[PDB]
Amino acid sequence: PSLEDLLFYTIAEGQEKIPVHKFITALKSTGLRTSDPRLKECMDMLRLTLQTTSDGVMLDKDLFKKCVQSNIVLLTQAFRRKFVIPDFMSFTSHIDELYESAKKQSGGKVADYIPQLAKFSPDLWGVSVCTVDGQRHSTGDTKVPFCLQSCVKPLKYAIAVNDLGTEYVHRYVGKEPSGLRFNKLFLNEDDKPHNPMVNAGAIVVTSLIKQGVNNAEKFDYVMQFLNKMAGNEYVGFSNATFQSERESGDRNFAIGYYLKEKKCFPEGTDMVGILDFYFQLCSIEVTCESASVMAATLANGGFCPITGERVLSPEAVRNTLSLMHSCGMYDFSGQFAFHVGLPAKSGVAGGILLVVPNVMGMMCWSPPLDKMGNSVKGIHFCHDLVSLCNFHNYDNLRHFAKKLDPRREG
Amino acid sequence: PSLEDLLFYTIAEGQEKIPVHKFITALKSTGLRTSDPRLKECMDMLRLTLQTTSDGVMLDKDLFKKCVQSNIVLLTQAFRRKFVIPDFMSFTSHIDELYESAKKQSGGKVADKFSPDLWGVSVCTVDGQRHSTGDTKVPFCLQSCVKPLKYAIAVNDLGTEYVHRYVGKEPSGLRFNKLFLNEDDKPHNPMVNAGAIVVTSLIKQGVNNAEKFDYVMQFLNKMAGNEYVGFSNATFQSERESGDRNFAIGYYLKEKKCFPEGTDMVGILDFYFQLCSIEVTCESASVMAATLANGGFCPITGERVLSPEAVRNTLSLMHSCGMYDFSGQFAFHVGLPAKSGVAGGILLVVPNVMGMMCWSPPLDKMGNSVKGIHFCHDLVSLCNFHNYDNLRHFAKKLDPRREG
Amino acid sequence: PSLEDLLFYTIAEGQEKIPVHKFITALKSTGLRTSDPRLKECMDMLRLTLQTTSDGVMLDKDLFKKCVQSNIVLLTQAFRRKFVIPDFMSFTSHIDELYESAKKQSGGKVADSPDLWGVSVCTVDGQRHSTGDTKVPFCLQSCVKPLKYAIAVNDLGTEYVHRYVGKEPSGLRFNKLFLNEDDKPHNPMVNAGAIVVTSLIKQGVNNAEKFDYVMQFLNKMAGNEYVGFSNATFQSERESGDRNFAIGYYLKEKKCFPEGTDMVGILDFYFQLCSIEVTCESASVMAATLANGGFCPITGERVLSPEAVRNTLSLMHSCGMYDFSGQFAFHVGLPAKSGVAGGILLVVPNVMGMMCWSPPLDKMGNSVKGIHFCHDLVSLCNFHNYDNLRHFAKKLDPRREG
Amino acid sequence: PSLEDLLFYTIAEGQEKIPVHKFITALKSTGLRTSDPRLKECMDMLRLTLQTTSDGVMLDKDLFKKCVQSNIVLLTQAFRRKFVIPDFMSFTSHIDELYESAKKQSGGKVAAKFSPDLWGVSVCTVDGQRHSTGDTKVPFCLQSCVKPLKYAIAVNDLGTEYVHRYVGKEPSGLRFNKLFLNEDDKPHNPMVNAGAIVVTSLIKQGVNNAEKFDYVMQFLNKMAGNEYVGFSNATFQSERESGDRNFAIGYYLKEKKCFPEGTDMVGILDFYFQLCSIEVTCESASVMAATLANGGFCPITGERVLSPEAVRNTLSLMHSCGMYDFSGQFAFHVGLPAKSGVAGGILLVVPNVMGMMCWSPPLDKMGNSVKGIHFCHDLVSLCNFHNYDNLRHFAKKLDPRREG
Ligand SMILES: O=C(Cc1cccc(OC(F)(F)F)c1)Nc1ccc(CCCCc2nnc(NC(=O)Cc3ccccn3)s2)nn1
Ligand SMILES: O=C(Cc1cccc(OC(F)(F)F)c1)Nc1ccc(CCCCc2nnc(NC(=O)Cc3ccccn3)s2)nn1
C-alpha cells in the first residue's frame, strides 16, 4: 500500500500529478519551514529535480516518491494533521493579534546602566514560536540580535544538572524562591544561594560547569551546548556588552567575595575567573527565532524539535522548568505563576524566554522594562496568551470554559 | 447503527447470552464501581431483572440492551478502554506496591489521639475509576486540607479579583512562616491560617453562621459526589479551647481591618473551627480531589461544582503553598498540587488524571504525614505525573495514560 | 556654737530680728516650696507663732531657733547653697526660655488640647519649678511602663523579671514583632513587654488589690502629690484594644506569662494602668525619685531599690521613645519615656526629674514640643549622659556658680 | 604665705629637710608617675640638683621650691588629695583583686602552645593617676578597638552632620547583625565593619594613604600622651589576605554609592587593614581611653586632642554598639562605654573618672575577651560606675571618688 503512495494521493486532490509549488505551499501551511534540518534530503532532491527536468515542472508518482521517501515519516505526521497544533495557520493569526495588542502598550524604561543597551530602540518588539514538532512562526523584530542576560540562567543550570545530576548541583544552590523580603540577601539560612535564577545562585551554578578546564574551553563547551539547543540557529557573543558588564559589576563582585568567604564554591574555584565567565555567559546573543527554538527544546523534554537531537536529560529539563515557574520573573514571579502559570525567564535586555510544556517554546523581546525588570510588552503578551488559550499550568485539558485550545478541533 | 448491540458481543464471547456476574466482573475491571451515580438506571434495571427469577439470570441481546441503553455512552467508553487510565488493573497493582513500601515508614508523631498505624490511600480518576488500599473508610477531620476547598468556594462565588483584595497569592518564604500579614497588610495566601481565616469571612456574607455551615456542607457534598461528609464536634470543641494563636491572628486581622465590613471576627473564628472539624474518608476526599483534577466537574456524577477559574487558582496555591515549610521542596520534587492537614491527610491532585487522598496520622516535624509524603515521592518517581514531566520523553518513568 | 544660731546670723545679716516674710522669701528662692513635707514642723510652728502673737511680726533668735530646729539640716543645705543646682533662680529662667521656645512649634496631631503645654521640674533635693499648663491632669499611658517595671524589679529582683522580658531594643525593623528570638518580648518598654510585666506584679490577689497596690506605690514616688484615674480613658482603651488582645493571645499561646495567669484579666489591669492620671508637677516628682536612686526627694522616703531604678533608667535610655529611641539616645542622652497623651517623663540622673506635656504628637508618637524641649535642654546644659563634667565647651553647667 | 613652702612642710613633717627619695615615694602614692609629661620641668630640676653632688642628698625649703615651682599647681592638687580618686592606693588594691579574679577564667579561644596566655589591665584616671597589673607592656593590635578612635577623629575634623550623612547612629538589632546597610542605604553605625570602612573613607580626603596613615598615627600619639603606638606588618598582611568579607562589603558600598565622591574603594580597604593593625599596649591604650573619659583632653599632657562633640558621639555609640551581639547585655549590666577587639582587647571608658585597657587574647563565642568581660562585670558590681548608678544612694557598692 505504501506511505509515500498514500501521502501521494492526499496532496494530489484529483489530478495525476502535483505542482512542486503546490506541494511546497501545502508544506508551509503545516508550519514547517522548507529549511527544516529534518527535511534536507527531500528539499535537495526537489531542487535537483528542478534542474534535471526543467520541462514540468511536475512530479509523477515515483518522482515524488523519490524526493520525500527519506523524510516520509515527518512529512506524513505533518500532512495528516498529527502535529501538536494541527490548525497552525489559525493559531498564528491569533499570535499576530496578541502581538498587535501588546504593540500598543508603549510604557517602560530601557535598561541604561551600560551603553550597549541604551542604544537599543524602545520600539523593537518581536515574538517567535517553535512548537515541539518544529512548527515555526514569527512576527515583529525577530531577527535582531540581543543578549540573553539572565535568560541564560536556566540554560546553564540545565547544563550543570545534565552533566552532574540534581543532587550534586543542589548541594550548592537551593531550590525555592526567596520570598519578597529576602530580595536583597545573598544566601538562605543554609548558607546556599536561594535558587539558580538569582544572580548569586547563577554565579555558583556557573562555578560547577566543566570544572578544571580553563575559561576559554568552558565558554566553547557552553556555546556548543546552546547551538544544539537552538538547532544550530544563531547563537552569538557581544564583546561590547561583556566589557561593560565587567566594569560596572560591583554587586556581582560583592556577591562573589561573600560566596568565597562563606565557602559556597567547589574546592579549587578561582572566584574572579568565575565572575569573568559569568559575565561572558550573560553576553551570549540570540534572536527571537533562535531563542524560541531553545525554549522548545525545554518544552520538548530535552529533544531539539527541529533536529530530533537529544540535548538535555529529562531530569535537567524538569528541574529547570520548575524553577522558572517559581523564580524566573524576579519579584513578579509569584504573580506570574498565579496569573500565567508558565515557566518563564526574563532578562534585562527585554527577552522573556517562555515554555508551554508539551506544546511550544517562545521568545518575546521588547527592550523597555517595568519597575521589576520585566519587558512590558512581553508581560502583557503573556497574560493575553493565557487569557486566550488553555495553556495555564493548571488549566484543565477537558473543561476550560471559553478558552481556546489550539491542540484540537475543526 | 447498533450502539448497544456492539457492546453485547464485545462482552459475550460470540455467544448466546451473558451471565450477569460476568458483566459485573467485566465492569469492575474498568475501575468503575457498580454504585457509580451515573450507572444508577442500569443498576436499577438489573435489580428489576434479577427479581423476575432466581436463576442465572442471563441476558439476551434484547434484555442486555434494556438494562444498558440509559447509560450506554459511559459504558462503551469504559469497555473500549477510553478512560484516562485504560489499564487500570495494572495501575492499581502499582498503587498497591507504593502503598506497601510507604507502610514500612514507621516514623513521625501523632498530633495532640488516633492510632499511629492507620494508613490509607484512595484514587478517583477524572473518569470515575476508583481504587483503595488500607484504612480508607475511617472518618477523620480535614483540618487544613479544607483550606483549598473553601478558597475554591469563595472564588467560585465572588471571583478572583474580589477574593484577592483580602488575601495574597504567593508563599511567604521560609522566614515569614511566622508573620500574619505581608507588606500590603494582607495574609500571604489562603493556605496559611491567617489567610484561611480571612477567606472564611468572605463566604456567604450577611447570612448567619448556621446557614453558612449548611452551604459549605452542601458544597462539599457536590464535591464528593455525595459520598461521606460529616462533622466532629469533639474536634471542634478541642480546636476552640486551644485556638490561642488563631485568636491572636483574629484580633490582629481585625485591628488591621483585614475583614470585609460588617464582619463579626469572634464568630468567623468559630465558623473557621467548624470547617476544620469537617470529617471525610480517604474515599470521599479522593472524589473531592478528582473534582479539582477534572476542571470543577465531579467525575462520578457529571455535575459542574466549581468554576474553572476557582479550580485553577486553587491548584496554583496548592502547588506553592500547600505543604507548609515543605512547599518548596515538594513542588520541586513532586510537582503536584497538594494540601496536608494535621490529622494526617494529604489531599493530592494530578491534573487531568486523578485525585487522591492519603491518610496516616503520624506527622513529620513540618506537620506532614510521613507515609503520605513518602508515597507522594514514590508516585512521581514511578509515573510521569510531575507537573514538568514531559508527556512524550520521560526516560524510564511509567505512563499510566498509555497502553501496552 | 549651734547650727540654728549660725544659720540665724546668715539670714539676719543686719538687724537683731528677721521678719518672717523675709525668711520665707529667702526660703522659696532656694527653690523649696513652703508646702514641702520635710518643712511641715517648721511651717506649723511659724503659723502657730503668727497666731501666738499677732504683732511684729518680730522673730528674734531664740524664736527662730524653736521654729526651725526640727528641720535644721535641710534648711542649712538650702541656705548654704548646698543643693544640686545652687543658683536655682537663674536655672528656672533658662527653663522658661526653653519652654517659650518649644511653645512656638505648633505641629503634630493629638491622639484622637493642641494648645496645652507644660513643664515641671523637681530636683534630687526637692527644688520645684513649673511653667505653663502644669496642674492639668492627664493619663500616664505608656509613661507608666518604666514605673511598673521598676515596681516589679523592686518586689521581684532582676533575675525573675527577666526570665519573662528581654533587656534590649532590637531593630527599627523588628519593631513590629511581639517576641524576640528567645520567645520573650523584647524589653519592658514595648506593649508586649509591658503586658508581661503587668502580669508579674502582686500575683495571687484580685485586680482591685493589684491596682490599689500600684497606686499606693505611685503615691510614694510622687511624694503624695496627685495620682488619679480616668475611667473614661479606661473604657476607651478597653474597647479599642484589638492590637493588645492580639498580643495577649500570642503571649498565652507561647507561654510567656507566669503560671496561673488570667490573660484577659491581665489585659484589663494593663488598660487600668495606662489610664492612671498625673499632672506635670506630680509626675516630675516621680521622675525625680528615679533621678535620686529611688528616694522620693520631697519626702526622703525610700521608694524603690537601686537595682530597680538602675534597670529602669537603662531601658528608658535605649527603648524609651518608640522608633526615635536610637536618635534620642544619641542626640539627647537622657533616660526618657513618652506616652500618647503627650507626656514625656524625663530623668537627668543625679540632678532632677521632669515631666513635659503637650498632646500633639509627631509621626513617631512623641510630643512634638516635648521633643523640641529635650533637644534644647541638652544643647544648652551639659546634661547629656556622655557630656563631660569638666570640659564641656560653650554649654552651661547649672551645678555651679562661678 | 606661698604655695611651694606650704607644700614643703606637709611633705617634710616638722623637720629640716626633705630627702629626695621621700618626695618621690610621696609623689608615686598619689598615682602620678615620675615620668608624667606635666612633671618634666620638676624632674629636670631634680636631675640637675642630683648632679651637683654625690650622695648629698636632700632639699631645703629653698631647694625644694626651686624644683617644684613650675609644676606647683599640679603637685598641690596631688598632695592635697584633690584627684578624682583621692585614695588611689586603696583603689589599685581593688583593681588587683579584680584582676586576679578574672585571671582564673580560663575559657575562650584565640582568634599547639608554648607559653601561658597573657592578661593585662591598665588604669589611667582623668587626672593622670596610673596603675597596671599583668602583661601591660606587651604590644598587640587594636583591631576593632580602633573603630571608636577613628570615628572620633573624623567627627573631630568634619563634624557630626557630615560624618552621619555616610554612617548611621544606632545599633541594628541582633537579627540584622548580618546586613551591611540599614533602610537608608547607609551602614548602621561606625562600630560595625561596614560602618568603620566608610568612616575610614572620610579621614583626610585628598592626600594619599601613606599621609593619611601618618596623620592617624600622629592623632593616636596625642591621645596616648605620646606613649606606645606602633604597627604590625604581620597582622596587616594576614588581615588583607583574609579579607574576603571586607571586600564583599567594599563592593556593596561602592555599588550602593556609600562613599564620598572620588573614593578609591580598593585603596580604602588597604587603609582600613592598616588601621586594624596598629599596635598599642595596655598602658598606652588606657591613656587613649582616659582622653575619651576626660572630654577630649589628654590627662597626662593637658593637650586638647578631640572636640567634645567627637568624644560625646563616640562614647554614645560605644555604649550601644561596642561589644558586638553582647552590646545590649553589656549596656544593661555594665553600663559603661567600651569597645572590644579580636586580638583580646577591651577599650573601657568610665566618663569623668578614668580610661582602661584590658587585654587577654582568648575570646568568647561572640568575639569578646573572656577575662576582660569578667573583669568589667566585677568592676561595676564593686563600684558605682554604672552609667545609671546613683552617686548619692548606691547600696553597698564602693565609690572611690569619696574619702573614707
Ligand atoms: O537593604 C537593606 C534595608 C533593609 C534593612 C532591614 C530590613 C529590610 O527589610 C526588607 F528586607 F524586607 F527589605 C530592609 N538591607 C540590606 C540588604 C542587603 C545587604 C547585603 C546583604 C549581604 C549579607 C547577607 N547576605 N545573605 C544573608 N543571608 C542570611 O543571613 C540568611 C539567614 C536568614 C535568617 C536567619 C539566618 N540566616 S546575609 N545589606 N543590607
Ligand atoms: O518568631 C519570632 C522571633 C524568631 C525568629 C527566628 C527564630 C525564632 O526561634 C523560635 F521562634 F523558634 F524560638 C524566633 N518573633 C515573632 C514572630 C511572630 C510574631 C507575631 C507577629 C504578628 C505581627 C506581624 N505580622 N505580620 C507582619 N508583617 C508586616 O508587618 C510587614 C513586615 C515587616 C517585616 C516582616 C514581614 N512583614 S508584622 N511575633 N514575634
Side-chain angles (χ1 to χ4, degrees), chain A residues 139-154:
Chain A
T139 183
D141 306 295
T142 54
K143 293 177 160 69
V144 181
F146 62 92
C147 292
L148 275 166
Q149 292 284 7
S150 282
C151 304
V152 89
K153 283 172 170 45

Side-chain angles (χ1 to χ4, degrees), chain D residues 38 97 134 175 188 217 221 242 288-289 383 396:
Chain D
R38 310 169 289 166
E97 282 180 84
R175 176 38 206 148
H188 302 276
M217 278 288 328
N221 295 327
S242 77
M288 302 188 171
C383 305
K396 301 296 150 141

Side-chain angles (χ1 to χ4, degrees), chain A residues 81-98:
Chain A
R81 303 229 139 186
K82 292 291 167 178
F83 279 167
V84 64
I85 295 178
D87 188 357
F88 193 67
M89 275 175 63
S90 182
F91 179 72
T92 62
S93 175
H94 277 118
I95 294 286
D96 287 338
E97 276 159 20
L98 297 170

Side-chain angles (χ1 to χ4, degrees), chain A residues 181, chain B residues 175-176 178-183 252, chain C residues 173 176-181 183 250 254:
Chain A
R181 312 265 191 159
Chain B
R175 283 275 56 232
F176 314 116
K178 301 166 171 181
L179 302 181
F180 299 170
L181 308 178
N182 70 20
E183 275 166 69
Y252 196 79
Chain C
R173 175 75 152 109
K176 295 211 273 180
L177 268 39
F178 305 165
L179 301 188
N180 63 13
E181 322 202 41
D183 284 347
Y250 195 75
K254 301 206 66 208

